[PDB]
RNA sequence: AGGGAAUCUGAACGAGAUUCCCACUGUCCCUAUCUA
RNA sequence: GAAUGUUACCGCAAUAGUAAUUGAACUUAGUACGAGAGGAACAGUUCAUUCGGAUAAUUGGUUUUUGCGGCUGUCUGAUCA
C-alpha cells in the first residue's frame, strides 16, 4: 500500500499501476496554481483518492491532466 | 503476584484478554474460570469486562489502551461499543479508530507514559494516541520485528522483549522507554511475549506452560516481589 | 532411543503367537475353493495364504526387534544397567534368535511360493501349503524359551525408572538400612520403605526436586556390602555425572560396625574419586578423620526427625553441583485481601455462581447487572438501535433537544419566507 | 445491527443482503445488490451513471449541504444509556425525517420551477 | 460414537426428562390452556353483543 | 491440534492443486496445496480447504530454506463468497495462506494484508502475527 | 436413496393427514395437539444468541424463517374411537348443526350445480330438545378411548382463490374423556385461535405434501415430488395477530409494520390474520396447506429450552431485490417523483 | 499522407513426436440453467 | 381403472419398506493417577463429517419475460420506429 503526493506523480502510465493514494496538500503554492484550473473540478477530486476503482476512461482523465501540469512547469 | 492460568486450555493470555491498571477486559467463553481467575486476584477493585470485538474472542490483540483511554478498531459494532462504555468508569475514554490495520494489540504497545507503534501507521492515529491516551509515540522496530505489540511486553515498572533482540537494540530502545528491558520468553520458549502474558503495575498473568526459570525473570523485571 | 522404554508391543509366548498369526490367515484370507476350478485360481489361492502368513510372522517379529532397545548402541549407563539386571549375553542371544527366525520364515515363504507355481492337483497344492505353514509353526515352536524371556524383560524394563545422565544428579549411598531412605522420604514425593532389614530396596529409586529454579534428581540406591542388585549401585556411581552422598549411622542401629563403613568407603574410593564426595553423619572419633584423608570429602551431622538440617544438606549439595516517574496502583487493590481457596469466609466468584445456578454450559451470564448506570431500574436495557431505515447510534448524541430546537429556529426562519406554497 | 450504505448507490444495505468486498489494502466495499457489485467489478465511475446517488449529489438533482443531513454522522464517543435520552431520540428521528422530507420537496419545487 | 439408540444416552436423557426439561413444558402447557380458556370468554362476549 | 474451540462450516474455495499466495515474511511468495487435514470423504471428490483450515502445502515460488519439506499451512485469505453470522456474505481479492508448525505456532514474524475473522478466532498465534484482521 | 421413503409415489391428497399423535396424560388440562394453516412465505431474521457453550454466545445470528398463514381454526365436530384388537374404529361422529358455506362446499366436487342440500335432515334431526344428539354424545363419553376434534380452516380470510375449506381431525391430550367431549360441546360453531395451541419457543413438526416436480429420469426413473413428508423440530419464533398492527416490530426495530413484504409474498397475497413464523424451511411450496402437530414427546435440549429474542424482521421485496422495508422508506430515500409532483 | 524453452527424430523448420515452464478453459471437483 | 346401490367427506391400519453416521471442543482438569515426563473417564453443554429428507429468506448461477439498455451491420428517399 503506497502513498505519494500528486506533485511527485507529475515530475515522472507506469506510476498509476503501483499506486493507491495520491494526496491533496494545500500548504504548497504549487497546488494553489493547480487548483486554479478548468480541471481539478467535476469528479477529479474523488478520482485522486481511489485509484483502483477508476477504469480506462478515468485514467485518461489523469493522463490528459498530467500534460496540462507539465506545460505549467 | 505472578498468576498462572489458561483460557479454554490456552497459554496465550494476551490474545484472549487485555489487562491494564484501571480495568481488565475478558472474552465470553463457555468456561467462566478465566473470568474467575482475575476475579480471584483483582476482586471488585478494578472492573472486569465481559466483552467482544466484532464478535471475536481475540480481544487483547485487537484493542489498545492504558489507564486513561481505550482504542477499538473499525470492525467494533455499536452494540459492543455501547457495552464497553456502560461497563467502564468515566475516567477511561473510548474511541473507535479507522485505519489500514485492525489488530491494535499488535500495533500499539504502550504504558501510562510511553507508546511504541508500527512504522507504517497513519498520521491521524499518531495524533490520536497522543490525545486519547496522552502518551509519547515512537515509530520504533524491535530487532526487525515490525509488529511491536506481540513481541514486546510493557509496563510502567519495566518491559520484556523477545530473545532475538540485540544488545544495541536493548540499550537504544530502553533509552526511548526509560525502563529496564530484559530479553526473555514465556510459555516454555515462545517468542510471542506480548500475547503470552498480560501485565500492569501490580499483576502479571502468564500461561500454564510458563516454566519457573522464566517466571523468576518476569517477576524480577516487572519488580513485583 | 532415550531414557525409558515402556512403549513396546507385547511378546506372545510362542504357542499363542502361533494362534494369533495362523488364525488371522484363516479369517482375513478367502478360505473356500472347489477342486473343479481352473488350476490358476487354485495356485493363486494357496500362494496368497503362504505369503500372507509369511508377512504375518515377519510383522510380529519386526515389532519385537525394533521395539527392544539396541543395548550396545544406547548409552554406557544403560548398556551396563541392563547388563546388571539381565544376562546381557542371553539378552543378545534371545534377540539373535528372533532375527534368525524372521530370516527363516522369509526363506520358507519364498521357497514354497516358488514351489507352488508347479502344483498339478488341489491335493498337491494343499499339501504344499500345509507344509509351508507347518514349517513356520515348527520354527516358532523352537522359540518358546527366548520369547518367555522377552516377555519378562519387556514387563520389567517397562517399569524401570528414567534417569537423565545430562541433568544435575546426586547419588545417595551408604550401607543398606543406614537411614538414607528417610532422607529421600523427607526431601521429595517418593514412597521408599524404611523397613528394619538389610536389602529392603532392590533397585534405583528416583526423586525429583527443585532448587534455585532448576531440575534436580537424587537417586536412592540399595547399597554396597557382589550382586546384580549391588552392582547396579556401583555402576550408577561410576557412569553418572554426579556427587555421591555416603550416609553413616553413628548409633547402635543398622546392625553393622562403623569401621566396616570406613573399610568400604576407602575400598570403593577409586570409582567415586572424580565425583566430589559429601559424607553425612546421621581413637573412635579419630577414625572419622581417617575418612577425611580422602582428597574430596566433607562431613556433616544431621537428624531426619527435624526438617531444617535435611534441607541444609540439600543446599550444600546443590551449591557443590553448580560449581562442578511513578506507577499507578489504585488503593482499592492495596487494601484488598488475598484469595484463600480453603477459606469458609470470602467472596463468591463467577465459577461458584455457575455451580450454584447449575452447570457450566447451561448457565447464561447476565452481561447486565454488572455495568454502571445512573438508575438501576433501567439496568435491563432494551436499546432500539434501528428506527426506519436509519440506525439510532448514528443519530445518538447528548444535547439533542437543544440541537433540535436550533433546527426549530431554522424552521421558523424558513416558514414565513414562503418556500412552502 | 447496522444499516449500511452501498459503495456504489449509497442505498441502505440491510443485514443479509448483497456482498462486502475486501481489498489487499483492507477496506470494506458493501453492496446492496449484484447490480451494484458487477458495476463495481466492471470498474465504472458511479458519478457518471445516473441511477446512483453519487451522481445526484454532484449534479445537484438532490440536496447535499443541509442541517438535517449533518446529524446522520458516524458517531464514535458512546453514551451511558438514559431512558429519557433515548425517548428523546425516538421522537427526534421521527421529527428530523419529516423536516428532511419537506426540505427535499422544497428543493424539488425550486429545481422544477420554470417548466409551467 | 454412541448411537441414537445407545442405551446409556437414553437413560441419561431420562435423568434430564424428570427434572427442569419437563417442568418448563408443563408450565408452557398451562399458559397455552389458559389462553384457550380465555378464548371462550371473548367469543361469549361476541355472543352477548348479538344477544344485546 | 492448535485450533481453539469449535469450528463451524464456511464454504470451500481452495481444493487440492490450488496455488495460493504466501502472506508471512518467512520467505515464500506462493503455496501449492497437496492435502487438506481434517476433511470429509466422498467418492471422486477432491479435498477442499477453506479459510482457517490447516492444509499440507508445498512452496513453489520462494526461498530454498522453506522448500525441501512439505509443511502445514493455515489459509488466511479465501476470495470465495463465504457467510458470516452478522448478515453479510464476503470475499477477498486473492487466495493466501501462512505456514506454521503442527502445533499451530507461526514461523513468520508478521502477516501482510487482511486476515479473516474466522481464521484469527480459531488460530490464536495467527492473530498474534496479524497486522490487519478483516 | 433412502429406502424408507418408498414407494416414491404421488400422495392421496394435498392435505396430508397426520400419521401419529402426541401420547396422552390423564391429569393435564384439555388442549389441542395439532393445528393447520396455509404455508406461504419465507423471510430473514436477525437475533442475538443466548445459547451458552457456543461460539456465538452474546453474539448476533442471521437466519431464514418461514411464514405459515394460520386463520383461526373453526370447530365443527368431534370423533370418538374405540380401542380394538384391529386398531381403532370410529363408532360415532357428531357435527355442529349449522356449518359454514365453506364446508358444505367441501362435501361437493361441483358446487354451483347442486341444490346445496347437505346437512338439511341432520339439522332437522337436531330440531328439538336434542334427545338424539345427547344420545350420541353419551355414546361417545361411555365408550371411545380417544376423542378427536373435527375442525376446518377459514379459507376466505386467506387471500387464496379456492373458497373451499379443508376438514381435519385433531386429538385431545387433556385427560378424562368426559372433559374431551364436553370441551367439544362448548366449542360447536365456535373458533379456536392459534396462540391457544402454540406459543413462542415451542418445537413443532410441520407436515406437508412436498412440492411436485412431475416425471423424472437402484436409482430409478419415475415420479419426483408430491410426497407426504413429516419434518420434525422446527422452532416457533413468533405467533402473530391480524388486528394488531406492528407485527413486524420487534423489541429493537419497533417500527409500525406488518411481516408482509412490499407487494406481498410471491405467488401469494399478504397476511390479514394470525400467522406462525417458524424457523428453517417447512416442506411444500407457497399456497400449500400445512398441518402443524407438536413434538410427540418431551424434546427438551438447549435448542428447545432457550428464549428467542427477535431483533429485526426483513420485510424487503422478495419479488425482485430487497432495498426497503416499508413503502415509507422507499419514497423517503428516493425523494419525490414525477407523478407525485 | 494459446504462447515460450528444451529433447527424441528427417540452424530454422515440418499442423513430425515427447517433456517441461507460463497462460487458458465445465475435463473434473459438481453440476446448474437456457435455446434449437 | 370397471366391479361390489350411487355419490361425497373423515378415518382405521393388516401388510411391506425404514436411517441415521462418525469426529472433537469447552467445563469435569492440568484433578484422578503420576519420581518425573505426562495425563484420563462419567454426568452437563457446543460444534463439525459423511448420509438422507427437504426448502429458495439471502448469496452465487442462470434468461426466446429475449424485460430494458448499449454496439455492428442492413431498409423504408432523411429523424423516430
Coordinates of C-alpha atoms (C1' of nucleotides) in Angstrom, one line a residue, chain F residues 5-9 40 42 45 89, chain I residues 25 46-51 58-59:
Chain F
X5 CA -12.7 -24.0 20.5
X6 CA -15.2 -25.3 18.0
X7 CA -15.1 -24.9 14.2
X8 CA -18.1 -24.0 12.1
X9 CA -18.9 -24.6 8.4
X40 CA -14.7 -35.3 4.6
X42 CA -16.8 -38.8 -0.8
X45 CA -14.5 -35.6 -4.5
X89 CA -21.6 -12.5 2.5
Chain I
rA25 C1' -14.5 -28.7 21.6
rU46 C1' -21.1 -27.0 21.9
rC47 C1' -19.9 -27.6 17.1
rA48 C1' -18.5 -30.3 12.9
rU49 C1' -18.0 -35.1 8.9
rU50 C1' -20.4 -38.4 5.9
rC51 C1' -25.7 -39.8 4.5
rU58 C1' -30.4 -14.1 1.3
rU59 C1' -25.6 -15.2 -1.9

